[PDB]
Design brief:
Chain A: Belongs to the peptidase M16 family. UQCRC1/QCR1 subfamily. This is part of a larger assembly, with chains A (47 residues) and B (80 residues). Chain A has 47 residues and is mostly helical. Helices cover 36% and strands 0% of the residues of chain A. Chain A is built from 2 helices and no strands. With 80 residues, chain B is mainly α. Chain B has a single domain, classed as Single alpha-helices involved in coiled-coils or other helix-helix interfaces (Up-down Bundle). Helix content of chain B is 50%, strand content 0%. Chain B contains 1 helix and no strands. Chain B starts with 27 loop residues before the first helix and ends in a 13-residue tail after the last helix. The chains are: A mainly alpha (47), B mainly alpha (80). Chains A and B meet through helix 2 of A and loops of B.
C-alpha cells in the first residue's frame, strides 16, 4: 500500500482533504502574534 | 513588528467559527432590527433636538424675510 503511493497520488489526496477546507485551531498561551481565523483560512489555498 | 508587543493579557478564551459554518446576516428580525431601533431610540433625543431648533430658526427667518417684502396698506391709507 505504501509502494503504491507516488507524488501524483499524494497531491490528489492532500488536496482532497486539505485544500480550501476550513480548519480547526487551538491556541494556548502568549498567542497575540498569531491571528485572525480569516487570515489562517486564506492560508488554505494557492501554492 | 506591531503584533506581539501590544499588551499583557491573561486568561481569556475566545471561540469563533469559520465564516463558512455560519450565516452572513443572522437573526435580521429577532436580534438585528431590535438593536437598530434600540440605538435609534438612544440617540434621537441628543441629536434631533438642535437640528429641529435650527429648522425653526430657518423657517422663521426665511418667512419673516418674505413678510418684509409685502406691502403694508397703512402706508397708503391717505395717499389719494
Amino acid at each position: 500500500r505504501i509502494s503504491a503511493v507516488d507524488a501524483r497520488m499524494v497531491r490528489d489526496v492532500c488536496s482532497k482533504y486539505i485544500y480550501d477546507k476550513c480548519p480547526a485551531l487551538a491556541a494556548v498561551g502568549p498567542i497575540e502574534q498569531l491571528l485572525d481565523y480569516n487570515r489562517i483560512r486564506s492560508g488554505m489555498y494557492w501554492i | 513588528i506591531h503584533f506581539g508587543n501590544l499588551a499583557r493579557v491573561r486568561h481569556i478564551i475566545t471561540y469563533s467559527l469559520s465564516p463558512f459554518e455560519q450565516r452572513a446576516i443572522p437573526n435580521i428580525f429577532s436580534d438585528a432590527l431590535p438593536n437598530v431601533w434600540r440605538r435609534f431610540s438612544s440617540q434621537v433625543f441628543k441629536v434631533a433636538p438642535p437640528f429641529l431648533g435650527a429648522y425653526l430658526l430657518y423657517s422663521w427667518g426665511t418667512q419673516e424675510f418674505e413678510r418684509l417684502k409685502r406691502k403694508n396698506p397703512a402706508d397708503y391709507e391717505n395717499d389719494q
